[PDB]
Design a protein around this ligand. Structure first.
Ligand SMILES: COc1cc(Nc2ncc3c(C)nc(-c4ccccc4)n3n2)cc(OC)c1OC
Lengths: 295, 257
């Protein structure tokens, strides 16, 4: 641990405070994740290390080392330049070019596809969990709420995902999580890149739900079999009509809208998988454009 | 839906690596298979006491067997190993894991809180944070997606059998988790519905009914002798109405393979 000189703080997140740091000996620039150490090693950290050690992929941030000492636990990570959320904010006026959106989504979908076919659920995909570099790459990060689904994963009664990017199944109280929840998140982010505004920005749990209903139409038995039997469904739910996608995501072409509705499909059983999404007509001309990063 | 066939291939590869040394107990000078049985049985009680998932119990054993594969442990400290493994397994698997104070408690205050946490630290070191281990239970739930159609008595029996394999290191270390699961699933499917290891699963796993025989012969033995076995926590567990009282079902006298 005496090898690394701490350079600066770069934000807190789930497990704990994160620093940019340099390897005094190799020169390699890393991201240090510090943990103070008394209920033992934190559940989130045990899960993050354990699962990331397995997930070696270009679009998943690499866990480079784990330093185990007396009173402190450090997780060494590869370093990226900023989060997608901050890049979106810098783009606000100009906008993210459609080719770069396509490139980012393609890459994220590869990362997610890798995660899923290795029985790992991310469960917390949001623009501040996705990391980019100057070379046009994007990678999944913060696996503190990640879970192995060799056996199906039971849902928390008090849910700890972001509200805005939460799938409707979770909000309606279904027993198990699903790969489909991660697809939903990317869908919401995909639309947000396109529109410069968040797709469903809810105040509360019920506000979030209704916002999903106002845009995509209130689900019923024809659309999503078993909807009304779910624990948190209420008969007195307002019945909205589905809205024309060309008024939801205007700058997207037919393919873009085609993929997006499949990513936001109501039934988690019939929602497009990451694997399938990669083969969608939308990515037929995908390239790897370079972003313009500020500061 | 789509990731399933990839997950089987990946889990199949991962059980070869996360496998303990077969005859590790003979290299353990102070402990024997007997004492391990007692510990594992105790962990089942611990599991039922705190209503922890069966997967947690499975992991805990995997950790114990791996830790004991490379660390010499005197008998008086075996439980401290077992208690740390459980705590770690709970942390990996349970949504809200039991507090450390709780684990310290159920040891009849044999060890202090400090002792358990320093052990947890050491178990992590020895296993090198590789906790995402593939279990018999993991394979069973994946296999269940091949019933035509699903039967909870079939499931509950397979689970019971697979759980029983955790107690006896002899002979069950000879078999990969996926093989035990194959045996358990066939035996349950045969006792309950009368059916056999399905064609679709032969193609998926590669295991012919023939190949599962050496494992089936052993498992069937444990099932038949289960009422007389020295460790009873599991049979008690599974005579519950939740698990359809399957531990009370009579095993078939011959598997006729
Ligand atoms: C998140 O915003 C910036 C990220 C990074 N780089 C970076 N690289 C790797 C990394 C990992 C494994 N985990 C985190 C993280 C940190 C805090 C909150 C959430 C996640 N990061 N961050 C660098 C910045 O300054 C250079 C940023 O501020 C713009």
């Amino acid at each position: 641990m005496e090898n690394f000189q701490k350079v600066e703080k770069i934000g807190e997140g789930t497990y704990g405070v994160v620093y940019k740091a340099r390897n005094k000996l190799t020169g390699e620039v890393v991201a240090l994740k510090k943990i103070r150490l008394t209920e033992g090693v934190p559940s989130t950290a045990i899960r993050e290390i354990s699962l990331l050690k397995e997930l070696n992929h270009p679009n998943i941030v690499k866990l480079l080392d784990v330093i185990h000492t007396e009173n402190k636990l450090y997780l060494v990570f590869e370093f990226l330049h900023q989060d997608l959320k901050k890049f979106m904010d810098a783009s606000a006026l100009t906008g993210i070019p459609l080719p770069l959106i396509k490139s980012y989504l393609f890459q994220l979908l590869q990362g997610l596809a890798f995660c899923h076919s290795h029985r790992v659920l991310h469960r917390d995909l949001k623009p501040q969990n996705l990391l980019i570099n100057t070379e046009g790459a994007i990678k999944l990060a913060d696996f503190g709420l990640a879970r192995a689904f060799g056996v199906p994963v039971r849902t928390y009664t008090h849910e700890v995902v972001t509200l805005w990017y939460r799938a409707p199944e979770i909000l309606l109280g279904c027993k198990y999580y699903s790969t489909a929840v991660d697809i939903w998140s990317l869908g919401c982010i995909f639309a947000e890149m396109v529109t410069r505004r968040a797709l469903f920005p809810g105040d509360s749990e019920i506000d979030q739900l209704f916002r999903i209903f106002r845009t995509l139409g209130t689900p019923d038995e024809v659309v999503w079999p078993g909807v009304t039997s779910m624990p948190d469904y209420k008969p007195s739910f307002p019945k909205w009509a589905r809205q024309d996608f060309s008024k939801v995501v205007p700058p997207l072409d037919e393919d873009g809208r085609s993929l997006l509705s499949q990513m936001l499909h109501y039934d988690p059983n019939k929602r497009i998988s990451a694997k399938a999404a990669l083969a969608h007509p939308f990515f037929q001309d995908v390239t790897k454009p370079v972003p313009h990063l500020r500061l | 839906p789509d990731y399933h066939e990839d997950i089987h291939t990946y889990l199949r590869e991962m059980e070869v690596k996360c496998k303990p040394k077969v005859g590790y107990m003979k290299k353990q000078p102070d402990i024997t298979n007997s004492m391990r049985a007692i510990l594992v049985d105790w962990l089942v009680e611990v599991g039922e006491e705190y209503k922890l998932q069966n997967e947690t119990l499975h992991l805990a054993v995997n950790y114990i067997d791996r830790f004991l594969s490379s660390m010499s442990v005197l008998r008086g400290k075996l439980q401290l190993v077992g208690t740390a493994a459980m705590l770690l397994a709970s942390k990996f698997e349970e949504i809200y894991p039991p507090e450390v104070a709780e684990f310290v408690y159920i040891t009849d205050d044999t060890y202090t809180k400090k002792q358990v946490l320093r052990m947890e630290h050491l178990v992590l070191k020895v296993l090198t944070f590789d906790l995402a281990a593939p279990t018999v239970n993991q394979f069973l739930t994946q296999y269940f997606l091949h019933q035509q159609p699903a039967n909870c008595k079939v499931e509950s029996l397979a689970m019971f059998l697979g759980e029983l394999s955790l107690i006896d290191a002899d002979p069950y270390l000879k078999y990969l988790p996926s093989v035990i699961a194959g045996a358990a699933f066939h035996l349950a499917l045969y006792t309950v519905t009368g059916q056999s290891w399905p064609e679709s699963l032969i193609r998926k796993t590669g295991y012919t009914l023939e190949s599962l025989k050496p494992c089936l012969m052993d498992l069937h033995q444990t099932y038949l002798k289960a009422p007389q076995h020295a460790q009873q926590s599991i049979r008690e567990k599974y005579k519950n109405s939740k698990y359809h009282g399957v531990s009370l079902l009579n095993p078939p006298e011959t598997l006729n393979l």
